[PDB]
Design a protein around this ligand. Structure first.
Ligand SMILES: [Mg+2]
Ligand SMILES: [Mg+2]
Ligand SMILES: [Mg+2]
Ligand SMILES: [Mg+2]
Ligand SMILES: [Mg+2]
Ligand SMILES: [Mg+2]
Ligand SMILES: [Mg+2]
Ligand SMILES: [Mg+2]
Ligand SMILES: [Mg+2]
Ligand SMILES: [Mg+2]
Ligand SMILES: [Mg+2]
Ligand SMILES: [Mg+2]
Ligand SMILES: [Mg+2]
Ligand SMILES: [Mg+2]
Ligand SMILES: [Mg+2]
Ligand SMILES: [Mg+2]
Ligand SMILES: [Mg+2]
Ligand SMILES: [Mg+2]
Ligand SMILES: [Mg+2]
Ligand SMILES: [Mg+2]
Ligand SMILES: [Mg+2]
Ligand SMILES: [Mg+2]
Ligand SMILES: [Mg+2]
Ligand SMILES: [Mg+2]
Ligand SMILES: [Mg+2]
Ligand SMILES: [Mg+2]
Ligand SMILES: [Mg+2]
Ligand SMILES: [Mg+2]
Ligand SMILES: [Mg+2]
Ligand SMILES: [Mg+2]
Ligand SMILES: [Mg+2]
Ligand SMILES: [Mg+2]
Ligand SMILES: [Mg+2]
Ligand SMILES: [Mg+2]
Ligand SMILES: [Mg+2]
Ligand SMILES: [Mg+2]
Ligand SMILES: [Mg+2]
Ligand SMILES: [Mg+2]
Ligand SMILES: [Mg+2]
Ligand SMILES: [Mg+2]
Ligand SMILES: [Mg+2]
Ligand SMILES: [Mg+2]
Lengths: 48, 117, 201, 103
RNA sequence: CCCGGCGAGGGGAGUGAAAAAGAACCUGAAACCGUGUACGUACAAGCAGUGGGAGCACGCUUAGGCGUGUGACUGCGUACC
């Protein structure tokens, strides 16, 4: 064991979602929000 | 950690502008105009790998017709007569014998006439 | 278990559950990563659009001039404007469970024994606080990169090792997981071995 | 003197001493291959036509190379629909040399 | 030292490891503007490419065909968000 020979367990290091970074990533442009609503706006949504 | 985009961005524009050489005007000098041109040239090349097989069969057929009508038979009757004689040579080879060996082509026509008779 | 001794060919008895375990790599990685996170300072910041100098005047009127609409000179789209998601000072430390921190120590110590990187002696000291004196002793035992764990702190052993960057001195109460891995060889006196088992148990 | 045979879903007209590029064969780079399905043999105004194969005709060759062809690019694009995709390709071949034609 | 208006600017000589390090001075990208060479172009109709394809120039090292630049003529084809 050395400082450059340790690795984590498989399945514990899921990567986060990054929106709006091109066509190929699957989340570009609208970034998962759809088209033209109150829910698509910055800060938008209704109270509980 | 601040990240600067200069070195990566420059190498990515040079890749597109090298695929676009020989084009006219801004289509080989300007990135915005040249990127569209490279995209359209790939669309055309995909389509023309299909049309290439169509344009060559159409050319072989027109040369077999010309060489058959000179031996007293048409393309339609020649092709039907070879199927009844069990001759499996294809269009590409037939249009090559017709140009470079006219003695062997006549032998094929006499075999198709005999089958039809 | 049973640990041999190099300077006196004796035998010393230790616990199996502290020196005979198998290596839990996933557990060790978590504790080592949390150690280096606890070393950070976190001192930095930038300025948002509300912290840049300048007034709140609208640069030009809303309609009629033929330009895109503007509302502030401190906009994060303009040159010399704010940073959209500016940073603040923050704390990067993580929590480690007590039983998890102690379990990772026992598998590090258990693996040093398998690879022959741990050696036990009765005594280890020098007469005077001289660097030349300690350097000579290490060369006789054929050691270059080494970590020395001693039962009780020594004034002369601490001073003689200060100017050698490849040699480090501790006591039993001051062990950390990262320096047990980073050093080529580990030297522990008999007194140190006794206290380490007691604090681990 | 030439003959016509088929190999790899295509047909070829060859003369002795020629090198022909075919589809990939499962033969080592030094061995000899055999083609016993011959469609016609023309030997200077003496012509044999197979119905569908010439009886007793066979062509001998020797494998001389293996490799991959030039690379082509596949580009797909749907305008105004937020869709794009690309791919590359490289096709395997086998070169043989015609050593003997016999009827 | 020489040309020039006892100019601006430049060519030599010299310094320096280097002056295409000469003060508009480290490196010195792109748009944009020129000089030279090869090929095409003055009876020809349109998103300027793509599939086919002669001729010319040039390098070939098994003299074999191959590589590189140009592109007459011809099928298909109304940019991107
Ligand atoms: Mg999608
Ligand atoms: Mg969603
Ligand atoms: Mg929108
Ligand atoms: Mg709607
Ligand atoms: Mg809606
Ligand atoms: Mg909605
Ligand atoms: Mg939106
Ligand atoms: Mg909004
Ligand atoms: Mg808002
Ligand atoms: Mg930095
Ligand atoms: Mg880019
Ligand atoms: Mg330019
Ligand atoms: Mg250029
Ligand atoms: Mg651009
Ligand atoms: Mg100000
Ligand atoms: Mg106000
Ligand atoms: Mg005001
Ligand atoms: Mg600022
Ligand atoms: Mg605690
Ligand atoms: Mg389109
Ligand atoms: Mg005057
Ligand atoms: Mg002067
Ligand atoms: Mg000099
Ligand atoms: Mg320097
Ligand atoms: Mg400079
Ligand atoms: Mg330049
Ligand atoms: Mg000319
Ligand atoms: Mg002319
Ligand atoms: Mg003319
Ligand atoms: Mg006319
Ligand atoms: Mg017209
Ligand atoms: Mg015109
Ligand atoms: Mg038209
Ligand atoms: Mg063309
Ligand atoms: Mg072509
Ligand atoms: Mg010419
Ligand atoms: Mg001409
Ligand atoms: Mg055309
Ligand atoms: Mg058309
Ligand atoms: Mg059109
Ligand atoms: Mg259209
Ligand atoms: Mg469009």
């Amino acid at each position: 064991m050395r400082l450059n020979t340790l690795s984590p367990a498989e399945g514990s290091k899921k990567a986060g979602k990054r929106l709006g970074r091109g066509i190929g990533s699957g989340l570009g442009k609208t970034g998962g929000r759809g088209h033209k609503g109150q829910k698509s706006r910055s800060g938008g949504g209704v109270r509980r | 950690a601040r990240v600067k985009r200069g070195v990566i961005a420059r190498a990515r524009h040079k890749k597109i502008l090298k695929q676009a050489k020989g084009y006219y005007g801004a289509r080989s000098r300007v990135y915005r105009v040249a990127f569209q041109a490279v995209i359209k040239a790939g669309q055309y090349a995909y389509r023309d790998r299909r049309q290439r097989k169509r344009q060559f069969r159409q050319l072989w057929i027109a040369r077999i017709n010309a060489a058959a009508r000179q031996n007293g038979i048409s393309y339609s009757k020649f092709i039907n007569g070879l199927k009844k004689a069990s001759v499996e040579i294809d269009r590409k080879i037939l249009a090559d014998i017709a140009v470079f060996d006219k003695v062997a082509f006549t032998a094929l026509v006499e075999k198709a006439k005999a089958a039809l008779a | 278990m049973e640990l041999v001794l190099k300077d006196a060919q004796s035998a010393l008895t230790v616990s199996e559950t502290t020196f005979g375990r198998d290596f839990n790599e996933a557990l060790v990685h978590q504790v080592v990563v949390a150690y280096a996170a606890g070393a950070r300072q976190g001192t930095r910041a930038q300025k948002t659009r509300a912290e840049v100098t300048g007034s709140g005047k609208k640069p030009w009127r809303q309609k009629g001039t033929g330009r895109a609409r503007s509302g502030s000179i401190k906009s994060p789209i303009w040159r010399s404007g704010g940073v959209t998601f500016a940073a603040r000072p923050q704390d990067h430390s993580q929590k480690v469970n007590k039983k998890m921190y102690r379990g990772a120590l026992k598998s590090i110590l258990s693996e040093l024994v398998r690879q022959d990187r741990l050696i036990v002696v009765e005594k280890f000291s020098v007469e005077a606080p001289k660097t030349k004196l300690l350097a000579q002793k290490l060369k006789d035992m054929a050691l270059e990169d080494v970590l020395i764990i001693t039962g009780e702190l020594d004034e002369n052993l601490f001073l003689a090792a200060r100017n050698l960057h490849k040699v480090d001195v501790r006591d039993a109460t001051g062990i950390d997981p990262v320096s047990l891995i980073a050093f080529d060889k580990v030297v522990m006196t008999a007194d140190a071995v006794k206290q380490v088992e007691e604090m681990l148990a | 003197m030439y003959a016509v045979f088929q190999s790899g879903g295509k047909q070829h007209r060859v003369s002795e001493g020629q090198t022909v590029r075919l589809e990939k064969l499962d033969i080592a780079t030094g061995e000899t291959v055999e083609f016993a399905e011959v469609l016609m043999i023309a030997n200077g105004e003496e012509v044999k036509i197979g119905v569908p194969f010439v009886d007793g005709g066979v062509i001998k060759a020797e494998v001389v190379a293996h490799g991959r062809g030039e690379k082509v690019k596949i580009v797909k694009f749907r305008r105004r629909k937020h869709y794009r995709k690309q791919q590359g390709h490289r096709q395997w071949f086998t070169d043989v040399k015609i050593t003997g034609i016999s009827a």
